[PDB]
Amino acid sequence: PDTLVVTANRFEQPRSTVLAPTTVVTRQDIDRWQSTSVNDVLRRLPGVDITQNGGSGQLSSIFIRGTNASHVLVLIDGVRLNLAGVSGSADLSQFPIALVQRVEYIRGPRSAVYGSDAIGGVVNIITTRDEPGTEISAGWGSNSYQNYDVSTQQQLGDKTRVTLLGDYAHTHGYDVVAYGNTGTQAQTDNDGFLSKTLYGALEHNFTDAWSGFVRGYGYDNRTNYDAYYSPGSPLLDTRKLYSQSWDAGLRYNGELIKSQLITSYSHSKDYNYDPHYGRYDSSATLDEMKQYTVQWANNVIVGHGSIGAGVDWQKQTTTPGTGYVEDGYDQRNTGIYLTGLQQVGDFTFEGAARSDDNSQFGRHGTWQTSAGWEFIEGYRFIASYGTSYKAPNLGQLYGFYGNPNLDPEKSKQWEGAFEGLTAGVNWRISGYRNDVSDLIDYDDHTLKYYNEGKARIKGVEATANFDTGPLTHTVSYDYVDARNAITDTPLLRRAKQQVKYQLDWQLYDFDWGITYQYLGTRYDKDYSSYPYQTVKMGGVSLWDLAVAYPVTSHLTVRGKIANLFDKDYETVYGYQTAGREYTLSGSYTF
C-alpha cells in the first residue's frame, strides 16, 4: 500500500467551537450548488429558516433555531456587517455571492463567543481564499438573469500576493405582489435587482511568521420592490445601497502562539426613494453608517487544546434620520474575551467569557461552556450552556419608533447532543432550549417598540451524512417550537419543521446534485385588513436539480433548475416566490 501524509497547515487558526454545532461551506460547495445569493446557501444548513419578501434582492430574514431575525449575528471576516436600520435585522440578499469564499456558521449556546448578541447563531462570511489562478465566469437564466465575473490571485513578488475581483449581476426579476402592503393599488411591475462588486487585496509575508494585509471592496445594489400606494404621494419603491469596506492587519503565526491585530472601516448608504421625486428629494430615506473596528486576538497552544484572549473596540456613527433618529447617533463599544479548550482522556471541555462596555448601555458579561464525553469509541455526549445579551439599537430607543425605556434582550440557553459514526453514517441528534427575556417587538397600533415578555424555544436538530456507492447524502431535520411564553402563542414566520436533503453523484463525468427541502407549518400576519389576523401557511416540498460538466481541463459548464415542479408557495404572506427558474453558466479557469 502507498502511504499519503496529511500535515496540519499552521496558517489555519481553527476556532474553539469544536464542541458547538457548526457548518462550513466552501467555494466548492457554492460553485456546485450554483447559488446566486447568500440566502440560497444558508437555507441548506441545519437550524436555519429563511424567509424573503420576494426574490433576488428583496429583503430576506434569517431565523436561527426559532430566534428572531435580529438574533443572528452576521460577520464579514470576523467583523459585524454594517447594520443601520431600526429593525436591527441583517438583509443578506444584499451581500454579493461573488465575494463569498467560505461560510462559517454556528448555532446554539456557544455562538455568543463571537459577540454577546448572537442569541440564535453566527454567520461568518469569509471573503478571502488561497487559490492561485484566474477565473472568468458568465451565466444566464430565467427573468433575464445575467452574471459576469473575473477574479485572479497572483504572486506580486515571492512573499507578496494580490487578489482582484469584479462581478456584475442583473435580473429583471418578477412581480413580488406584496399583497396587503401596497395600499390603494398593486404595482404589477417586475421587481429586479442589479448588483456590481469590486474587490482587491494585498498580502505580504515579512517573515515566515509575520504577515501583513490590506484589503478594500465595495458594491452598489439597486433593488425594485412594491410599496404602499396613496394617490398624490411619493411611492418609495426602489432601494440603492452602496457599501465599501477597508481592512488592514498584522499577524504573528508561530508554532504555539498566534496573534492578530486588525483594523476595519466600513461605510454604508442605504436609500429608499421614489424614482419620480428622486433619491435626494425630501421624500427619500437614507440609513448611513460608518463603522470602525479594531480587534486584537491571541491564541496559545496548550496541551490538547488552547487558550485564547483578545480585546476589541468598535465605534458606529450614523447620519441624521438613520433609524429615524432625527440627528443620528454615535455608539462605542470596548470588549474583552477569554476562551479555553482541553481534551482530558475521554472528556473535552470548552469555555468562553466576554465582557462588553457600551457607551450607552454600560457593562455586560456573557459566558458559555461545553463538556463532552466519548463514552464508547466513536460516540459522544456533549452538554452545553450559555448566556447572551442584545441591547436595543439606538433607533429603537430614540428615533420616531422608539421607546427610550426599552430593556436589552437576555438569553439563557442549553443543549444536549449525541454524535456517532455508525456503519458509515456520521450522525448527530440534539435537543435545545432557549429562554429569551424581554423580547422586543414592534407595535402596529402605537408605532413603537416595546418589551413583550419572554420567549421560550424548544428544538431538536438532527443531521446524517453517509455515502451509498457513487451517491453522497447530506441530511438534516429541524423541529422548532418557538413561543411567546406569556401568551403561549407561536412566534411568527418560523417553520415548525424542516427537512433538507442533498444528494450528489457523478456518472460519465457529469456531476449531479439534487436538493430537496420540506418547509413546514408557518404563521404570518395578514396586513390586507386591520386588525391584522394571523394566517397559517401549510408545509411544502421543493426540488432543485443541478449538473456540471468539465468540457476541458480549464472549462466547466453548469446548468440548474430551481423549483423543478414549479411549486407555488410563499415564506412571507403576500410576497410571491420565483416559480421554476433555469440557469446556465460557465467557468474558464487558468
Binding site: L4, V6, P14
Partner: protein, 81 residues
C-alpha cells in the same frame, strides 16, 4: 494501477484544534477509465474524526487509464508538526 492525481484530504478542524493525529486506511477499486470506486474504510484512529475528509477527497482521485484493480489499499496519516 498507478495514481495520476490524489487530492489531499483536509485536516479536520476539531482534530487540529485538539492537537490530534491519526490515520485512516482505505480500500477501493480502480475502473477502466481511471476512476476510483467501491471505497471502504478499513481502519481509523481515532474513530469518528478523519473519515469524512478522506471519503470527500477520494471522490476526486484519478488513476491511470486503463489498468484496473480490486482491493487497492492506501494508508493516510494525519500529523501535526
Amino acid at each position: 494501477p498507478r495514481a495520476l492525481s490524489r487530492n489531499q484530504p483536509q485536516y479536520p478542524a476539531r482534530a487540529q484544534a485538539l492537537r490530534i493525529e491519526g490515520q485512516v486506511k482505505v480500500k477501493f477499486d480502480v475502473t477502466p477509465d481511471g476512476r476510483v470506486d467501491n471505497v471502504q474504510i478499513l481502519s481509523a484512529k481515532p474513530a469518528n474524526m478523519f473519515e469524512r475528509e478522506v471519503k470527500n477527497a477520494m471522490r476526486r482521485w484519478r488513476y491511470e487509464p486503463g489498468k484496473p484493480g480490486s482491493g487497492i489499499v492506501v494508508n493516510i496519516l494525519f500529523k501535526i508538526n
